[PDB]
Design a binder for these strands. Structure first.
Ligand SMILES: [Mg+2]
Ligand SMILES: [Mg+2]
Ligand SMILES: [Mg+2]
Ligand SMILES: [Mg+2]
Ligand SMILES: [Mg+2]
Ligand SMILES: [Mg+2]
Ligand SMILES: [Mg+2]
Ligand SMILES: [Mg+2]
Ligand SMILES: [Mg+2]
Ligand SMILES: [Mg+2]
Ligand SMILES: [Mg+2]
Ligand SMILES: [Mg+2]
Ligand SMILES: [Mg+2]
Ligand SMILES: [Mg+2]
Ligand SMILES: [Mg+2]
Ligand SMILES: [Mg+2]
Ligand SMILES: [Mg+2]
Ligand SMILES: [Mg+2]
Ligand SMILES: [Mg+2]
Ligand SMILES: [Mg+2]
Ligand SMILES: [Mg+2]
Ligand SMILES: [Mg+2]
Ligand SMILES: [Mg+2]
Ligand SMILES: [Mg+2]
Ligand SMILES: [Mg+2]
Ligand SMILES: [Mg+2]
Ligand SMILES: [Mg+2]
Ligand SMILES: [Mg+2]
Ligand SMILES: [Mg+2]
Ligand SMILES: [Mg+2]
Ligand SMILES: [Mg+2]
Ligand SMILES: [Mg+2]
Ligand SMILES: [Mg+2]
Ligand SMILES: [Mg+2]
Ligand SMILES: [Mg+2]
Ligand SMILES: [Mg+2]
Ligand SMILES: [Mg+2]
Ligand SMILES: [Mg+2]
Ligand SMILES: [Mg+2]
Ligand SMILES: [Mg+2]
Ligand SMILES: [Mg+2]
Ligand SMILES: [Mg+2]
Ligand SMILES: [Mg+2]
Ligand SMILES: [Mg+2]
Ligand SMILES: [Mg+2]
Ligand SMILES: [Mg+2]
Ligand SMILES: [Mg+2]
Lengths: 129, 149, 141
RNA sequence: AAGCCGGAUCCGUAACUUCGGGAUAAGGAUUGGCUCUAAGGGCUGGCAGCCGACUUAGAACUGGUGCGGACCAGGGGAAUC
RNA sequence: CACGGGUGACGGGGAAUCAGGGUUCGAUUCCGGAGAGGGAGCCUGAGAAACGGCUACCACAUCCAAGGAAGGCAGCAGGCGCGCAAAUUACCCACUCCCGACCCGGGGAGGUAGUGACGAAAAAUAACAAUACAGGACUCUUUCGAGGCCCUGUAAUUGGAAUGAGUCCACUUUAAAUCCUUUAACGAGGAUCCAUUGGAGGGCAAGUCUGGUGCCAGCAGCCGCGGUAAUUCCAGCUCCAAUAGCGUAUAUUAAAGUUGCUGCAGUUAAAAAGCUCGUAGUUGGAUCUUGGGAGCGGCCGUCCCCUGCUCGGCGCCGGCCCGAAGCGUUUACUUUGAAAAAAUUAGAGUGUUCAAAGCAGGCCGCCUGGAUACCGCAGCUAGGAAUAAUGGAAUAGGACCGCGGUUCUAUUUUGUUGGUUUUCGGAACUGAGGCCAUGAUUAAGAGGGACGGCCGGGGGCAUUCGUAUUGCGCCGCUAGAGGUGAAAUUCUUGGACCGGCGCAAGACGGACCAGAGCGAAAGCAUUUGCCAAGAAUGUUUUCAUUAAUCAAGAACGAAAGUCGGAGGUUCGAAGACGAUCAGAUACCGUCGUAGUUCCGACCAUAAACGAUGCCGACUGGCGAUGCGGCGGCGUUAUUCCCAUGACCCGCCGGGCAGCUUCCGGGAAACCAAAGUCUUUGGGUUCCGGGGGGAGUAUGGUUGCAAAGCUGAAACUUAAAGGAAUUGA
RNA sequence: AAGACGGUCGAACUUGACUAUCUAGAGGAAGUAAAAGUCGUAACAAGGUUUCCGUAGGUGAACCUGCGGAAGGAUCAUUA
């Protein structure tokens, strides 16, 4: 069955992005996906998105640009310290200039660069570049 | 997919977005539930109490006209069944199939089904025991199941 | 892997233990059945007395009579067939004398066109067979 | 032919097998006398009184190591037809 | 993952290799443990089950007058034995320390020498100039050649200068010495004061040089070389690699993304259980606090605020603000702080002549150093509250709010000693109340269930029909009929085959019948009746997470086979015969047993195949087909129109499939899945690690048996295999 | 002080059992590798009877035959 709902959003986005579509539909909506998508906006990797609000787990329509290469989820959510953060970005990011790791901390869901500035690690969720 | 079948069907009910009582419905909450009580006195599971309400009286969902679901209405009044109706119908079906097997024993296919109904009972039985609606000693016995239909 | 859950450490490690036994190199190293069959007992070298001089025909695509020697290891008593390495060295070897025997390259595997030998003579009568070949030293008398 | 074993209690028990056996397999220890201890019940009006009848287990002591002291009382194992 | 067994097992600090991960080692100088030939028991003592203490037995072994006595190197040396495998029967307590009655004695602890290519650091085996020669940039010169302003190399040519290896006066070192350092004197021309170890077909740097042998000798880790012109053997010469080192055998690490957590593979190469159910294990849908306000700078970034309840102070006017004891769902997670031995590793300072090292040194008595980081996991401490668990009030046996009683009961209270009772506080129970905005998230393109009309070679039981086959009875006419590539065995005037009429039995359900349906798979097709089940569709019904995959375990499982009954038409293993053939224990033909059929029990195996696990999500089209529903011009049947059936045109949802494609993948064949994979991670089960030996031996277990499941090793081998191409 | 009844720890000896490792054995039956050996031709082409899987029986040997399967076939196709 459906065990992870973030893995279905990122995979669906990647399939539509890789084919040149302008809009994609994420079928289940969660606070994690919405929070993951806003981190994807502050760096200009996606446009603005809608949250269709039915009385169930809602849907999301995302305005896609051509600025995305691959968004991917990491399962299971490993616990990573700040000493180990350097290693993780050395395996699953293309180069030291661009690409971000999105991990959840006690201060919220945020990318690895801005998590390092406030000195707090957490659990990894995914990445994009 | 189905628990005990290879089919993957999609047929199901779709609740409308609006959850307010319609303007044409004049039956009110206080005089909805005593109709439920008298239909339960006839002898009717809550599944078929709501079936004959939304085709003959226009009350779509009692949870919207009344403040609670049908089974909560019955149990607060004291008319809830001894055991849940969904578990009841599995036991009634297992009795019917098991009775068919003693009449004719070469029915290998019918025997294979009997595990599937019985497996569903035990899976469902342990769920209700964690919810503390059946006693911890409640056990399904194929020999004595016939007495409680 | 196949199972990826955060609480599947025992499943992953236990699966590895079982599947290492299907590795040929690991199976022989961690079962003694290979070491018992080894004449050397795991040692690199062994000394033995010469019992006979034997010549073995080479494999089919070649045509020669390889010069070998039958010895019985002192530490064990097992019979092995050592190969006299270099050209004409078999004359330095006589019957019933102590030789030093080592492996012949492939770690217990037949090597070259010589059929079914693992070992090689390196010293005779406590003097190196290379010194004899170069004329540096003579046999001890 | 004669001879060995023999009862009971406590351990222990193979090959083979038609899974029933083999089996008291085979092989070990104990047993006397005396003085005690505990356990095992009915009647009357978780208690009190009164009646009892045979067994088992344990302990101390003691004899010239002797004790199923007479009688009764399986020698065993490995194989072939 | 107990219990048992193995360990070529003392544990740890650590060591080797390594990108990131990991794999292997750790007898060995520090810490802890155990032991003194194997066990056992003791005295003394603060401390021993002590062995350079004792008492016995066991094994070994020494002296003897034969009565007796004495023994324990896994301490330093040294001997034997074992082996591939490891040093002197040296000197001194001079240093570091320990012991004692002790400043004074002792210490095979320890230090110093000797053996020592385990191994680690530095570093000789020549440097310079002149002559000839050969080149280069320079100039004249079309070239040659010429001049060297400038070089660069070569040459058993010449020439002097600088030294260390070695001998050795002495000093220094040291307990006494040796060595290192210092310094007198000797000490280099073929500076004979003479550098090795392996190689020269490819991998892999370097001769198609010459001589010898001639599939012999031999080389070769591998592919291979050698049969009278060898680039590989044996040699000479030449060249190549590292350099006081180098080769070889073996254990192990990287290479190995060939053990894959990062990070392998499972259609055809090795591979997915025949199928379903199922408990441990793993994993688990959405859902409850938003934001506002202060400052600066440029709408933005940083920093600030969003639980209350005993005692003293910013203290002030019974009150407030603050500080301090404690209180207040629990974790997992993350940051923080303590504690965590040194040595080692990383690393700061520091000219051991540099370095390996060491913890030292520097300035003209003083100045100084002997840091710091890491030290998983587990345990302790305080902040943060996203993510993931868990809890609350739902027969209210609820939270706060005060009122009324009963019981036990601390001590302020009666001037100073004794008696009761309150108040007073503390603990408990109980009655009647006020009040909460009084208290239940939604209802998953998750699931279970109910319901309605259907649908289907789904399953079981009984019944009914069909032609054919074989056999029998009768009738008709006849001499052949069967089979074969050709024949023969075979039947046949005792009337075969053929034709008709009937009867009996047992199998089997053609044609319709399809890349159509159902079933978990195996499988399932004449009619009708009965019984139980089932998917899909329809649904503003019901419960509310009840789920997915699954060790152990459970049910079904073609054919063949096994055991009991019944029946045995056809076909037909075995067998017999006739052909064919060199043979024919076969293919072909005649007969024919078991079986094939039904009933009741076993067996659990198939190319049980889609050679392709299950659940979930996404990513192109087009036309059909099956089931359910929805909508619509129109034909046709009921007839008497609504409505129903049969066609036609569409949409929706599952289903078996098809065509096409530069989605994408792949070794390709090919696949819309075998795609969304070095841009690698949705969940989970099984399973493979070169070819054989071998699904073999043995142990176990199941079975009446045949056999089923579990399942090695020795040994042998450079390939075996997949897809596709060109020939034959 | 020697010595003795008893109690405890208990080595060692004798016997029995159980377990692990190694080792001999008439004969029987495999596997592998040497070979210009004997007998056939089973598999590769429709390999001259298409091949292969499960099971059963038989034969000097490869193999053959019966039943039910698969195409990894030598047919993706056969017409109202
Ligand atoms: Mg399931
Ligand atoms: Mg070869
Ligand atoms: Mg007699
Ligand atoms: Mg017997
Ligand atoms: Mg006999
Ligand atoms: Mg050991
Ligand atoms: Mg150690
Ligand atoms: Mg050792
Ligand atoms: Mg000790
Ligand atoms: Mg010793
Ligand atoms: Mg001792
Ligand atoms: Mg000693
Ligand atoms: Mg000692
Ligand atoms: Mg050595
Ligand atoms: Mg001293
Ligand atoms: Mg002294
Ligand atoms: Mg020299
Ligand atoms: Mg010197
Ligand atoms: Mg080479
Ligand atoms: Mg080269
Ligand atoms: Mg070579
Ligand atoms: Mg040469
Ligand atoms: Mg390795
Ligand atoms: Mg690597
Ligand atoms: Mg591989
Ligand atoms: Mg395969
Ligand atoms: Mg399969
Ligand atoms: Mg969740
Ligand atoms: Mg340390
Ligand atoms: Mg028909
Ligand atoms: Mg199973
Ligand atoms: Mg069958
Ligand atoms: Mg059969
Ligand atoms: Mg039969
Ligand atoms: Mg014949
Ligand atoms: Mg025949
Ligand atoms: Mg026939
Ligand atoms: Mg199988
Ligand atoms: Mg398969
Ligand atoms: Mg991968
Ligand atoms: Mg293999
Ligand atoms: Mg053939
Ligand atoms: Mg053939
Ligand atoms: Mg033929
Ligand atoms: Mg073929
Ligand atoms: Mg046959
Ligand atoms: Mg194959």
């Amino acid at each position: 069955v459906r065990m992870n709902v973030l893995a279905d959003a990122l995979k669906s986005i990647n399939n539509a992005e890789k084919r040149g579509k302008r809009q994609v539909l994420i079928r289940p909506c969660s606070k994690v996906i919405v929070r993951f998508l806003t981190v994807m906006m502050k760096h200009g990797y996606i446009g603005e998105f809608e949250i269709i609000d039915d009385h169930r787990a809602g849907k999301i329509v995302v305005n896609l640009t051509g600025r995305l290469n691959k968004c991917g989820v990491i399962s299971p959510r490993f616990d990573v310290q700040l000493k180990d953060l350097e290693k993780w970005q050395n395996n699953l990011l293309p180069s030291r200039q661009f690409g971000f790791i999105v991990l959840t901390t006690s201060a919220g869901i945020m990318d690895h660069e801005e998590a390092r500035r406030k000195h707090t690690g957490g659990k990894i969720l995914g990445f994009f570049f | 997919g189905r628990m005990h079948a290879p089919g993957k069907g999609l047929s199901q009910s779709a609740l409308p977005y609006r959850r307010s009582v319609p303007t044409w419905l004049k039956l009110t909450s206080d005089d909805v539930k005593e109709q439920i009580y008298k239909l339960a006195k006839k002898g009717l599971t809550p599944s078929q109490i709501g079936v004959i309400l939304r085709d003959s009286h226009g009350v779509a969902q009692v949870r919207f006209v009344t403040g609670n679901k049908i089974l909560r209405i019955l149990k607060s009044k004291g008319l809830a069944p001894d055991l849940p109706e969904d578990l009841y119908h599995l036991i009634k079906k297992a009795v019917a199939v098991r009775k068919h097997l003693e009449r004719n024993r070469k029915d290998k296919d019918a025997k294979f089904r009997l595990i599937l109904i019985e497996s569903r009972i035990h899976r469902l039985a342990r769920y209700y025991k964690t919810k503390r609606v059946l006693p911890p000693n409640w056990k399904y016995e194929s020999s004595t199941a016939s007495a409680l239909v | 892997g196949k199972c990826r859950g955060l609480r599947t450490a025992r499943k992953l490690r236990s699966h590895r233990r079982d599947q290492k036994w299907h590795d040929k190199q690991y199976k022989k190293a961690h079962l003694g059945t290979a070491l018992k069959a080894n004449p050397f007992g795991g040692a690199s070298h062994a000394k033995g007395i010469v019992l006979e001089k034997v010549g073995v025909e080479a494999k089919q695509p070649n045509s020669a009579i390889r010069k070998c020697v039958r010895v019985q290891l002192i530490k064990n008593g097992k019979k092995i067939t050592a190969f006299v390495p270099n050209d004409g060295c078999l004359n330095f070897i006589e019957e019933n004398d102590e030789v030093l025997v080592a492996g012949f390259g492939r770690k217990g595997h037949a090597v070259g066109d010589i059929p079914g030998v693992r070992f090689k003579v390196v010293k005779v009568a406590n003097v190196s067979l290379l010194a004899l070949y170069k004329g540096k030293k003579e046999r001890p008398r």
